[PDB]
Design a binder for these strands. Sequence first.
RNA 1: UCUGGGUCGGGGUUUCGUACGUAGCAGAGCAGCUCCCUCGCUGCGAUCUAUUGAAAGUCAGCCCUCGACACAAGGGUUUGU
RNA 2: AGAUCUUGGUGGUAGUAGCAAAUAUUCAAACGAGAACUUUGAAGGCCGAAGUGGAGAAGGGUUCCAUGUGAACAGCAGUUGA
Lengths: 63, 31, 50, 50, 62, 107
Amino acid sequence: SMLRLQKRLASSVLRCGKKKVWLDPNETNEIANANSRQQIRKLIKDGLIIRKPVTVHSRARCR
Amino acid sequence: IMNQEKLAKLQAQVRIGGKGTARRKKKVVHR
Amino acid sequence: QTKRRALEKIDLKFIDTTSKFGHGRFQTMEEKKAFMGPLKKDRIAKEEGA
Amino acid sequence: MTHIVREVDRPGSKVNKKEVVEAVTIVETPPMVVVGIVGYVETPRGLRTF
Amino acid sequence: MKVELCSFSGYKIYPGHGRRYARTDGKVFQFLNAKCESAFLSKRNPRQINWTVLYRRKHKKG
Amino acid sequence: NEVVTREYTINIHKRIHGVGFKKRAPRALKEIRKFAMKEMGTPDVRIDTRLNKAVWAKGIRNVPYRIRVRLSRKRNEDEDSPNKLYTLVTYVPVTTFKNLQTVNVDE
RNA sequence: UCUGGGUCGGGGUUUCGUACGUAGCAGAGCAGCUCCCUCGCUGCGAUCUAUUGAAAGUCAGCCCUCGACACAAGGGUUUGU
RNA sequence: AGAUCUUGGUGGUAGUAGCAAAUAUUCAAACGAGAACUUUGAAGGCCGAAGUGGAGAAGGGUUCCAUGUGAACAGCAGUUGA
Ligand SMILES: [Mg+2]
Ligand SMILES: [Mg+2]
Ligand SMILES: [Mg+2]
Ligand SMILES: [Mg+2]
Ligand SMILES: [Mg+2]
Ligand SMILES: [Mg+2]
Ligand SMILES: [Mg+2]
Ligand SMILES: [Mg+2]
Ligand SMILES: [Mg+2]
Ligand SMILES: [Mg+2]
Ligand SMILES: [Mg+2]
């Protein structure tokens, strides 16, 4: 429904910004059931929440 | 195990973005 | 009409026929083709035409 | 519109028996088809359709 | 129908087209359009522009 | 039939000509939806996310001149809706736009 | 309607100026290999040459199609001496 | 009946001026009776470390967190909110 709390908790646990927080757009009702950081950790372990990779900024041109 | 029906739909779930984005690793349910 | 501007015979020598959809520079299709000769599309069309 | 080249036959002018370039306008005129006749009658109130 | 003139590019200039340019030295040039005139004024050699007739005959194209 | 699907190519450059820089891509999307409504006669038109990515590939103002799309009219009988048909528009990645015709594509 | 009008596509015109890739004993030169080569071969290398007046756009308010595609005798509101 | 009278209310103006400083949003889905504005995912952008970032002092005082509502406010809306 509205996953602002879930995004904030995921960014807190994952130690990354909200930019890198990826929630599964399919299992919205499953993620919305998460209201504790333990539940967020369990969801991260189960693969519903994934830390997105850092945006690529290569230095090959510089080198 | 993997068969043709399972593979053709697996390609969908592992792709969570366009070219240049990381692939999905797992989606495991456990109660 | 009595002024010498009027009652004056008009004898044409040339009429421009260049393309007004830009700075045209050729009068007729044949003149343009003769000045330019065959082109790449004409070459491939002749290849398809044996 | 386009332009033409003609020779001028205007005595006493600088361009007499010379070549000039004058813009012209093309007006396509397919033949008209007359399909009716109206007769007007003069009145002190002016012309009116009879 | 008048005298046909040749431009920077070597193209024929029909009457009523382009521009004529007379330099102080006593030489007269005529240009088919503003592109040829601008190319000439920058002292660009016509033999180095691929679509000029002089380049065509220099490279024996066609 | 009424569950027909077809492939088209669209002169986006013809329909964007004159649109300001910051509105060119949204205007292209609006023209795409309007063209789908014109061709399939369906008020309900959905644009696939891949097509949306393809149109926005070159940014907001440098919209690609031509694009190849596939129109698929499908039944909307999944819920009580005023319109029983909807048009799905997907992107067709093509190598070139030469001698491409509107062709009927089967299932 | 002897159909129509569209959308693509084609051609015409026009603009810019010769695309990528390939090939070159072209190329300032440089770096490797010598049973080799007897003067060679293998890279790096801007640029040039041929393909190539090429490539690309071209009505959206450019011209002509009779090529393909689908749609068009449908909707609604009023109007009487 | 007045005193540019006092207090309270109501007009025309008028559905008018206007809601234009700081480049820009688009697609799909979910909830919901209701989606331009909520949320998620994708894309394109911007702030470009003297930041639209991360933390404090003064000052505010519960605006903090969670849950619920859609009466009033957030000069449009809102399923959102200081
Ligand atoms: Mg003109
Ligand atoms: Mg065309
Ligand atoms: Mg009183
Ligand atoms: Mg009194
Ligand atoms: Mg008073
Ligand atoms: Mg107003
Ligand atoms: Mg205004
Ligand atoms: Mg920036
Ligand atoms: Mg800060
Ligand atoms: Mg709060
Ligand atoms: Mg309001």
